[PDB]
Structures are given as C-alpha cells and as structure tokens.
Amino acid sequence: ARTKQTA
C-alpha cells in the first residue's frame, strides 16, 4: 500500500 497514493 505504501507505494501507491491512498490519502
């Protein structure tokens, strides 16, 4: 998940 934008 860290390597995509989720915010």
Place this chain on the structure above:
Amino acid sequence: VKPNYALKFTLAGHTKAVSSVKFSPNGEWLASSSADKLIKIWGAYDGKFEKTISGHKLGISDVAWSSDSNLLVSASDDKTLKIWDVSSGKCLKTLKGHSNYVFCCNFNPQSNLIVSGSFDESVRIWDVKTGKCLKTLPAHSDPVSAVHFNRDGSLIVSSSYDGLCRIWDTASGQCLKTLIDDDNPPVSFVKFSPNGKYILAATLDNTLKLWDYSKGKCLKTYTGHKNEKYCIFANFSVTGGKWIVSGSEDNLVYIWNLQTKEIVQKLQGHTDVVISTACHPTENIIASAALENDKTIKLWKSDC
C-alpha cells in the same frame, strides 16, 4: 555547517516499487522491502546483495530489525506481519489479527515486543516469543501511517491520516497525549527523537514538524520538500552534524539543519518519489529508496 553526501552505490534487484529501507543496528546490513513481496539484504559498506527473504503473499510496506540484528519483522498487504530469522531467512512466526493491510512495524529496544499499524485503524502490540497479540488499540479513525517505540520502549507514538498523532503507554495501552492541528492535515509519518523527548511528524501539506509532545508545543517546522501524496519516512541524523533527513516527491533526498531549519543539502539521482531514507547508526551514510519508475536503493556517504 553542511554535509557533503555523495552517491556511492545504486542497488537494483526489486521488481516493483521499494517501500522501506532500514540499517541493521550493528551497521553491517541494509534491509529493504518492496511491493514485489520480498525483503532483500544488502551489505551496508560495499552495497553487495546478500540474500532475498520470501514468504508474504502480497506486497510489504515496512520492515524493522531487532536490537541484536538477528531478527526482522515485515508488515504486508496480506494482513499479516512475519518475524524472520535473518541468518536462515526462515519465517519464525506469522502474526495474524489485523483485518486490513499492515502498513508499519517496529520492535521495542528490548526486542520482546513488536508494534504494528494498519489500514484497519488499529495499533497492535505483539509478543515476539509467542507471536500472540497482546493488545489491540482502537487508535485512530483512518489508516495508521507510522508506529515507533521510544528509547526504552515505555511509549509508542502513532500517526494517522485522521490528522492525529498519539502517544501511548506501552504497558497499559492508554493514550497519554493527542497532538492536534486545527487545519487537520493527514499525518503520514512519525517517530521519536533519539533522546525520546521529541517527536518528528510529517503531514501531507509539505511540512515536517518537531514537537515537544509533553508540552504540546511545536518547536521546529521543516519545509521546502514535496510531500502531499505518500507516506515518506523521515529521520534524525546524529552521527556527524545534527540533521533532519527525508524523501520527497520531487525525487530528491532533503537534508535540513535540525536547529536552524535551513536545507543544507539535496541529493539528486533517483528517478521517482523517494519513499524512504534511513541513517546509518555509526557512519555518515544515508540509504534512500524510490518508487516504480526507479525501483533502486542508493547509498550516499558524507564527511560530516
């Protein structure tokens, strides 16, 4: 007055975006995790690839070392953490309980506990010996972006997209302090300072802030880098000059003077977002790692 970090090595091997890099406490190794589901171990001083550790079913967002450099823990999209024997590469235990991606993890200094944060909005505390979940904390109201123990493991700091940073008593699981900002930007990273007196929190408005959490006072604001999208790691560098180190969405590593807040160096070379940086425990060496256009880790060395 200013460091002079120069590129020494570029380490290739991961087949997707890298997510986190961490130096072993003994300073011999760098561990890296990736969306490619793998942990890799590299020599800290010659950049030589050492081994691949595999077993997670989906990508890994974080990795952390035990104080004796003998264990690793990893946090995965497969909703588990795994504890690994570094020497053999074997999975010792799989920690199950989170209901969504595990995003961040760390051992305490005693290395008998692991703390984890998840997209399930909870912080969990695990017994290393048994792999049992000791406590589940209903910590936040959005994904937990970071979890870190202080210098003696008595406190945990957590950060979340909910806009909060919380300080927790490890033994009791009680929240001792909530830090707030009236404009409430998502908090994308947090960690304690080496002395444990401060926290360093990143927010998705292109700022890093040093807080005296006991007093609820923001002491320093670091700006000028780009961070509005990803959960980028930041660091205290204490081996030479006292700096703050972070990745950036403009593909650079940023270095600030801790006290003055002046940017003292920007490290150019990566070709994608620098998602993670780590500072070597004894030498003036930085590791940096980048997203999908790049997929490499770089090692940089300074005289101070």
